[PDB]
Design a protein around this ligand. Structure first.
Ligand code: PLP
Ligand code: PLP
Ligand code: PLP
Lengths: 372, 372
């Protein structure tokens, strides 16, 4: 009840793209398992669609940010392993236990708590223990703390020691040796434990792309690369091609000539610099399109190159074109028309805005469609 | 299946705020009716809650951007009039006609196509005719086109001539007199009609706040002001107080000391200036908190004023504080703690981001809760 199927504005998600992206990243790292990280409604691309595409692409498990996102997948019909990579109130451990959802914990006392929640229910909880190696967001910060926590899960019959893992801060980036640092930090914080977990995993998109040999990549936690976006800072060249999954289109709802000097948009600050035609489409910055995307190209279906002008409004954008355009004509905001294309990267460049932030702004109000 | 009820991160929506806001706006303008404009999941604030707060506050009708939003309102159990202020595919006119939803049209052939959709169904559709007086988004551009359209709905017994309206581009603003321009333009395009609509309306928050006397304000199409946000450019003083409706809180999930020179966040670019404590909360930019919100104050429940450091990640944020803080402690990102307050405006100032854009960024992943 968020999407608007009767509004001719859509996000297109290419199946063939996602398939290629996982293949090429998996190839680069000779991974055995690909974990599709579809947190935040699949990086705002649309979870039901991306989850499906991910499995089609060959992912075999999921990573989500929180329990409720994990619940949603189960409710979607998926039976594959699901890791919650954020932290969870132990009071709600029972839900994860009942739906085979693996939960991360960063504290011995929270582990204890989650186990006591399950005491006597006949339920069992898979547990993961993130180790903080330098990101400093979550995880154990000392071998001693880690070893104690492992001790606790071994003494709790309702818990399974599913995994240990850590996350990189600069695998995205020319900063090797913060990568190497986190890796020696792992060795420090993690060397011979009193017992092993079922699995360990380390790699995000960055690791898999630019540092495949630094560390074990049998299990890859693949988020952004899936969506065909190069998020590196600065933009680093890759050992392969990503093809972006999402394109953004809508059909003209209002069409009119406007005369030189006519003001457009809130503030009345854009004035047409000559006679032409103004084209109104039904997506705005409430759909996720950059609040300051005005001045962006926009590829009309007839092969014209228009430009967003006036404000980008909440629900509507206005486009200036030289030649008449009929209502119903689709306009591509992101994607390809002929030999012209507009990318998320063009968008980032134009708005002086992070591509990671832009790829993540799309609201559920836009109707999603899977293609090729 | 979007909201995260088990995650301790919420949007709180102040009943007393919305009530005061509408009251104060209604009073300044002496409106007879107030139309809550709740497009875009109610400016990203949360539709089911804002609709309910809107009615409690004294709104007696709704305005939305599109048919599907109107549909959702109906499916929330609301029976009050609903005006769709965007344009709609005539093929879907029946859905509106079945649910007592008023629909805008900017064209004679669309009015005719919609009437023909209804012929023989026994249904009746309420139609509004937006007149473009200088915003140049949608609406009729000539008296000739307007009258030909008024005649068409008159000739069609499946249609009711519900309203004519127009929207201002600069009521937000000190550019009076583009205001006056639009008003003379109204006169120009609109003088002696062959038949009058049931109603006409003109005013948005801007008109109602800064230009109440310029034109009839019996019906006010109240958007931004309802949420207690002053969106004027440049920030203009008002003849009343707005009190912002939304605050943003979340409970600490991970808490640790960190030592001088420790790096935090993606890029490892923040270094702790001294020995301190790092507080991790479960909200990130995927929830709508500004992507470059790092450096913001964050008001911990114990009275401490912390700061967001490292990245604002997708789902999490890290906060540096001088003194240790227990897991489960709430942090206020937007709102008030003791004699300290952080507002949406503080956020716009700090991020150099439009406050209209920021107020519209919140994802449905955040749990909504109504307070006072
Ligand atoms: C978001 C996330 C991922 C995915 O990382 P990408 O850089 O998008 O490939 C993997 N592991 C954890 C713990 C995460 O939070
Ligand atoms: C958004 C909108 C409103 C509300 O405008 P505010 O400035 O937020 O009060 C009123 N009328 C129309 C046609 C709109 O699109
Ligand atoms: C000590 C100190 C630091 C340390 O940060 P580094 O980047 O590790 O040098 C930073 N800022 C201030 C004000 C300090 O006193």
């Amino acid at each position: 009840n968020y999407n608007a199927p009767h509004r001719h504005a859509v996000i297109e998600l290419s199946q063939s793209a996602v398939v290629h992206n996982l293949k090429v990243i998996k190839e680069n790292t000779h991974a055995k398992e690909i974990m599709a990280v579809l947190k935040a409604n699949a990086f705002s691309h649309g979870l039901p669609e991306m989850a499906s595409l991910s499995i089609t692409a060959g992912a075999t498990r999921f990573g989500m940010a929180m329990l409720d996102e994990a619940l949603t997948l189960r409710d979607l019909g998926y039976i594959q392993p699901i890791d919650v990579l954020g932290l969870t109130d132990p009071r709600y451990a029972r839900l994860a236990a009942e739906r085979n959802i693996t939960l991360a914990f960063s504290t011995k006392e929270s582990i204890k708590a989650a186990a006591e929640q399950l005491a006597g229910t006949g339920l069992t909880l898979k547990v993961s223990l993130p180790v903080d190696t330098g990101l400093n967001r979550i995880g154990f910060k000392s071998r001693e703390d880690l070893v104690a926590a492992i001790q606790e899960v071994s003494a709790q019959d309702t818990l399974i020691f599913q995994s240990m893992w850590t996350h990189f801060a600069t695998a995205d980036t020319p900063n090797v040796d913060y990568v190497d640092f986190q890796i020696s930090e792992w060795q420090r914080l993690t060397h011979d434990l009193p017992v092993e977990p079922n699995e360990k995993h380390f790699a995000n998109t960055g690791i898999a792309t630019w540092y495949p040999e630094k560390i074990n990549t049998d299990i890859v936690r693949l988020g952004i690369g899936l969506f065909g976006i190069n998020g590196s800072v600065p933009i680093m060249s890759m050992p392969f091609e990503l093809i972006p999954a999402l394109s953004l289109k809508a059909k003209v709802v209002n069409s009119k000539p406007l005369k030189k000097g006519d003001a457009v948009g809130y503030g009345a600050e854009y004035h047409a610099p000559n006679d032409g035609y103004l084209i109104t489409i039904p997506i705005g910055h409430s759909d996720g399109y950059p609040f300051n995307g005005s001045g962006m190209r926009a590829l009309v279906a007839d092969g014209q190159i228009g430009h967003i002008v006036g404000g980008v409004a909440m629900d509507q954008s206005m486009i200036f074109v030289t030649n008449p355009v009929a209502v119903g004509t689709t306009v591509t905001l992101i994607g390809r028309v002929g030999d012209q294309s507009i990318t998320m990267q063009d968008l980032a460049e134009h708005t002086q805005s992070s591509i990671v932030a832009l790829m993540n702004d799309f609201a559920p109000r836009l109707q999603r469609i899977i293609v090729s």
